Ligand binder design. Structure first.
Ligand SMILES: CCCCC/C=C/C/C=C/C/C=C\C/C=C\CCCC(=O)O[C@H](COC(=O)CCCCCCCCCCCCCCCCC)COP(=O)(O)O[C@@H]1[C@H](O)[C@H](O)[C@@H](OP(=O)(O)O)[C@H](OP(=O)(O)O)[C@H]1O
Ligand SMILES: CCCCC/C=C/C/C=C/C/C=C\C/C=C\CCCC(=O)O[C@H](COC(=O)CCCCCCCCCCCCCCCCC)COP(=O)(O)O[C@@H]1[C@H](O)[C@H](O)[C@@H](OP(=O)(O)O)[C@H](OP(=O)(O)O)[C@H]1O
Ligand SMILES: [Ca+2]
Ligand SMILES: [Ca+2]
Lengths: 144, 331, 40, 331, 93, 40, 21
C-alpha cells in the first residue's frame, strides 16, 4: 500500500484542474462530461452525498482515500452482490440462462454496451449450458 | 411526434403538479355548474338560474366538443392503436363511450331547446362527474374484490333473499286484513309486505308499515335477527377485501422498485471489474475514479431498495430466522 | 319552508368534491404509468 | 432549573399517582360546571343556575388564566424551544392554541356580560373538555389509521356518494308530484330527496319521507342494499386498522424494553472478565464478589426481557423451528 | 381502541348535538309542538341518531340543522359502529 | 314534560367521564416519556 | 391471494444454497 498512497493524490485533485485539495464535485460534472458521461445535477449531488463521508463536497481525501480503501471483495460486500442474483432467481439453484441474463443485462438499471454484455456471460457459461451460476461469477468478482 | 406525445401525457393518465390544476379546476367547474343547475328546483331560489347559466352550458359543451377531439387526435402515441382505423378501439374504452354520449347528447338537447327541455340538462350535467375521474382506478378495485369474493357474496345474498322471500310472505298471511291506528290497511298486497321486507332486512325501519297483529310481530322478530346478520355480512367481507388488495399492490410496487436497483449494482460491478481494457492511457486513468464512484451510489440505492419495506414491522415472525441461517452458513 | 336550503346542496357536493379531490391527487402524485413492465 | 423542570413533568405529559388526581379532578370540575350550565335550558330546572354559577365561572377563568401562564413559564425545560422567542413554537401546539382561545375568549365574554350573553358561555364551556386530554394521544391514532387506509376509504366514499347522488335523483323524478297521507308533498325539491338519500344510506330511517309511488320504492330498495354495504364498510376497515396499530406499538414498546437488558448483560460480562486489573489488594478482593453478583441479576433481567412476549401465544407457526435449527447447529 | 373510539364518538355527540339545538331552539313541528325544546331533547336525538336507530320522533326541521345532522351522522356512525368489528375479532381470537 | 330530565344529562356526561377517566389513567400509568431514544 | 410468499421470501432459497455446500 506504500507505493500507491502518493501518486493517487495526483489523480485526486486532477478534476479541479488546479493544485487545491478539492474533490471538486462542481467540477466533476464537467470532468465526467468531458470523459463522455454528462449526468444530471441530481445524480451528481448524489455522488459525494455517499462518496464523501465528511459532507462538504470537496475533500483532501478523508473518504476519497477510504473509497480507494474499500476493496469491495471481502465478505462484507460479497453477499450483497450475491443477493442481486437472488432477485432474479426462479426455481432456485441460480438457474440463470444466457438468454435471461442477456434479457436482464441490456434492459434495466444502467445498461451495458452490447460488446460488453455479449462477452460478460462468456466466462460464466464455460459449460455452454443454460445456467450461468452466481458462484462462477462472484469467483470472477472475487478479485473485484 | 414530440408535438403529440406530450399531450397524451397531459390529458390521459396525467402526471405533474399542473395536471392536477387542469383536471381538478375542470371538475370544480362542473360542480358549480351542477349546484347552480340543481338550486333551480327549490321554487324559491329559482331566480338565480338565469339564461347566463344556459350560455355557460353552451360554452361548456363547446369546450368539451374540442376536448374530446384533442384526446382523439392525441391517441396515436400508443402501441395499442395507431392511425385512424386503429383509434376506433380507443373509443371502446367505456369512459370515452360515456364522454361521447355526454358531449353529443348534451349538444343535441341544447340545440332543440334553442330554436321538459331544461330538465334533460340535469342528467347530462350529473353525468359529467364520472368522466373526469380518469383511468378507472376505482372501479377496477371493486370489480376485482367482488370477483375474488364471489362465493361468499353469492351465498349470503342467496340466503338473505330466500329469507326475505319466505318470511315476508308469512307476515302478509298474518296481516292481510288489519287496519292501522288511522284507518288504512298497511299490508294490502304482497308488494307492500315485500317493501317491508327489504326495508326491514336492511335495518332502515322507516315506520310506515309496522305489523299490528301479534302473530306478525313474532315473525318480524325472527326474520329481523336471522336476516339482518346475513345482510350485514358483505360490509365486513368487502372491508377485508379492499384492505387486502391495496397491500397486494404495495408488494409489487416495491418489487418494481427493487429490480432496477438490483440491476444498477450488478451492471456497475461488472464495469468495476472491467478495468483491464474497455495517447489512450490517461483517458483510462480517469475511468477508474468514476467506476468506483458511482458503484457506491448504486450500493446505497440497493440498500435503500430493500431496507425500507413499506405496516413496516412485518419481520415479526422471522426475527432471528434471517440471522440464524447465515451464522450457520458461515461455519 | 326552504329558508337555508342552499346549505345542503352546498355541503353534500362539497363532501363529494373532497373525495374526488383526493382521487385526482392520488393519480397526479403517482410515480409511473408503465402498463406491462412489471414481471419482465 | 430543578425548580422548573419538575413542573413540566407535573402539568404536561404527566406521570405519577397524584397527577391523575390533579388532571382528573380538574376535569370533574369542568363536568359539573357544564352539567349545571346546560341544566339551565330545561325551562323548569332553570332556577338552579343562579349567579353563583357565574362567579364559579369567573374563578374558573381566574384559575385557567394562571394555569396557562404556569405552563408557559415551565416550557423552557425543553430542547425544542428555549427562552422567550423560542417558546412561541410551543404555542403552535394546537392543544395550546385551543386552550388560549378558551381562556381569553371566555374572559372576554365574561367581561362584557358584567358591566345572548350567557349563551356564549355554553360553547366555551363545552370546549374545556378537549384541553384536559393531554398529549393528543387519541387523534394521533385516528389520523394515522385513516392515512394508512386512505385508498379504501376514498374508494368506498366515492362509490357511496356516487350512488347517493345518482339514485336519489331518480326518486325525485319518480316522486316530484305526489302527496302524503296527511296532505303534504314529501319530495318537493331535490334537497328533500337528498336528505332522504343521506338518511337512508346510513340506515337511520327516520320515517318523515317514505316514497309513496311504486316506482320509487323499487329504486329505494336497489339503492338501499347496494349502498348500505358501501357505507357500512369503513366500520370494519377502521376496526382492523385500530387493532393493528396498537399491536404495532406493543412490538416497539417491548423492543424498547429488550435493549437496556441486552446492554446490561454485555456491559457486565466485560466487567466480569476484567478481574485482572481495574494496600490496593483487598479492595480488589471484594469486587470479584459484586461483579459475579450483579451479573446474575442482569442475566435474570435479560431472560425476563424476551420470554414474556406481550396475545402471548404467537409462537404457533414456529414451534419446533426455533429448536430444529439449534440442535442441527450443535452437530 | 374502545376507549379511543368511545371518546371520539362521545365528543362528536357532545359537540354536534349542541349545534343542532342552536339551529333548532325555536321551531315547531308539523303538528304544533316544538321538538328540540331543551338540550336534553337534542341529546336524546344525538344518542338515537348516533346509534342509527332513527325513531322519528325528532327530526330537525330547519335546513341549517339537517346539514349538521348529515355531517355528524356519517362521521360518528363510523366511530360507533367500530366496536362490533373490534370485539368480533377479539372473541374469535 | 321534563320531569326526570336531569337523568339524561347525568347519564351521558357520566359515560363520557368514564371514557375520559380511562384515558388519563392510561397516561398516568404509562412507563416512560422519552421522545427520541428508541432506535439508538 | 397468490402473493403468500411474503413471510418466506428468502427462506426457500437460503436453505437450499446452504444445502448445496
Ligand atoms: C351508479 C353507479 C355507477 C354507474 C356506472 C359507472 C361505470 C362507468 C364506467 C366504468 C369505468 C371504468 C372501468 C374501466 C376503465 C378503463 O380504462 O378500462 C380499460 C379497458 O376497459 C375495457 O376493455 C372494458 C372495461 C369495462 C368496464 C365496465 C363498464 C383499461 O384497459 P387495460 O386495463 O387493459 O389497460 C391499462 C389502462 O387501463 C389503459 O387501458 C391503458 O392506459 P391508458 O392509455 O392510460 O388508459 C393501458 O393499455 P391497455 O388498455 O392496452 O392494456 C393499460 O395501462
Ligand atoms: C368535533 C371533533 C373534533 C374537533 C377537533 C379537535 C382536534 C383538536 C386538536 C388536535 C390535538 C392533537 C393533535 C396533535 C397532538 C400534539 O400535541 O402533537 C404535537 C403538536 O403537533 C405538531 O407539532 C403538529 C400537529 C399538526 C396538526 C395539524 C394542524 C407534536 O407531537 P410530536 O410527535 O411532534 O412530538 C412529541 C410530543 O407530541 C410533543 O410534541 C413533545 O412532547 P410533549 O412536550 O410532552 O408534548 C415531544 O417533542 P416534539 O414535538 O418536538 O417532537 C414529542 O414527544
Ligand atoms: Ca473546490
Ligand atoms: Ca467534505
Amino acid at each position: 500500500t506504500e507505493e500507491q498512497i502518493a501518486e493517487f493524490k495526483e489523480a485526486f485533485s486532477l478534476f479541479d484542474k488546479d493544485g487545491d485539495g478539492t474533490i471538486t464535485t462542481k467540477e466533476l460534472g464537467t470532468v465526467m462530461r468531458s470523459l463522455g458521461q454528462n449526468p444530471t445535477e441530481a445524480e451528481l449531488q448524489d455522488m459525494i452525498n455517499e462518496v464523501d463521508a465528511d459532507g462538504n463536497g470537496t475533500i483532501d481525501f478523508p473518504e476519497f482515500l477510504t473509497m480507494m480503501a474499500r476493496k469491495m471483495k471481502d465478505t462484507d460486500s460479497e453477499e450483497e452482490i450475491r443477493e442481486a442474483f437472488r432477485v432474479f432467481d426462479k426455481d432456485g439453484n441460480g438457474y440463470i440462462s444466457a438468454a435471461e441474463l442477456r434479457h436482464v443485462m441490456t434492459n434495466l438499471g444502467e445498461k451495458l454496451t452490447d460488446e460488453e454484455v455479449d462477452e460478460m456471460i462468456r466466462e460464466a457459461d464455460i459449460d455452454g449450458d443454460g445456467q450461468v451460476n452466481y458462484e462462477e461469477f462472484v469467483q470472477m468478482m472475487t478479485a473485484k | 411526434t414530440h408535438v403529440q406525445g406530450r399531450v397524451y401525457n397531459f390529458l390521459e393518465r396525467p402526471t405533474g403538479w399542473k395536471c392536477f390544476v387542469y383536471h381538478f379546476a375542470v371538475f370544480l367547474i362542473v360542480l358549480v355548474c351542477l349546484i347552480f343547475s340543481v338550486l333551480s328546483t327549490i321554487e324559491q331560489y329559482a331566480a338565480l338560474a338565469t339564461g347566463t347559466l344556459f350560455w355557460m352550458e353552451i360554452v361548456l359543451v363547446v369546450f368539451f366538443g374540442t376536448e374530446y377531439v384533442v384526446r382523439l387526435w392525441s391517441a396515436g402515441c400508443r402501441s395499442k392503436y395507431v392511425g385512424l382505423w386503429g383509434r376506433l378501439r380507443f373509443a371502446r374504452k367505456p369512459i370515452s363511450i360515456i364522454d361521447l354520449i355526454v358531449v353529443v347528447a348534451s349538444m343535441v338537447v341544447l340545440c332543440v331547446g334553442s330554436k321538459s327541455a331544461i330538465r334533460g340538462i340535469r342528467f347530462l350535467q350529473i353525468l359529467r362527474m364520472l368522466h373526469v375521474d380518469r383511468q378507472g382506478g376505482t372501479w377496477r378495485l371493486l370489480g376485482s374484490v367482488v370477483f375474488i369474493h364471489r362465493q361468499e357474496l353469492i351465498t349470503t345474498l342467496y340466503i338473505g333473499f330466500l329469507g326475505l322471500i319466505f318470511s315476508s310472505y308469512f307476515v302478509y298471511l298474518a296481516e292481510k286484513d288489519a287496519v292501522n291506528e288511522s284507518g288504512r290497511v298497511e299490508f294490502g298486497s304482497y308488494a307492500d309486505a315485500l317493501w317491508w321486507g327489504v326495508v326491514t332486512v336492511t335495518t332502515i325501519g322507516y315506520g310506515d308499515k309496522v305489523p299490528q297483529t301479534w302473530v306478525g310481530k313474532t315473525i318480524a322478530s325472527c326474520f329481523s335477527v336471522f336476516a339482518i346478520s346475513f345482510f350485514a355480512l358483505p360490509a365486513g367481507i368487502l372491508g377485508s377485501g379492499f384492505a387486502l388488495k391495496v397491500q397486494q399492490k404495495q408488494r409489487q410496487k416495491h418489487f418494481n422498485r427493487q429490480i432496477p436497483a438490483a440491476a444498477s449494482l450488478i451492471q456497475t460491478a461488472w464495469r468495476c471489474y472491467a478495468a483491464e481494457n474497455p495517447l489512450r492511457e490517461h483517458h483510462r486513468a480517469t475511468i477508474k475514479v468514476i467506476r468506483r464512484m458511482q458503484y457506491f451510489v448504486a450500493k446505497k440505492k440497493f440498500q435503500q431498495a430493500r431496507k425500507p419495506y413499506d405496516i413496516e414491522q412485518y419481520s415479526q415472525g422471522h426475527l432471528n430466522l434471517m440471522v440464524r441461517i447465515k451464522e450457520l452458513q458461515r461455519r | 319552508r326552504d329558508d337555508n336550503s342552499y346549505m345542503y346542496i352546498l355541503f353534500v357536493m362539497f363532501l363529494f368534491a373532497v373525495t374526488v379531490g383526493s382521487l385526482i391527487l392520488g393519480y397526479t402524485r403517482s410515480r409511473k404509468v408503465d402498463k406491462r413492465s412489471d414481471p419482465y
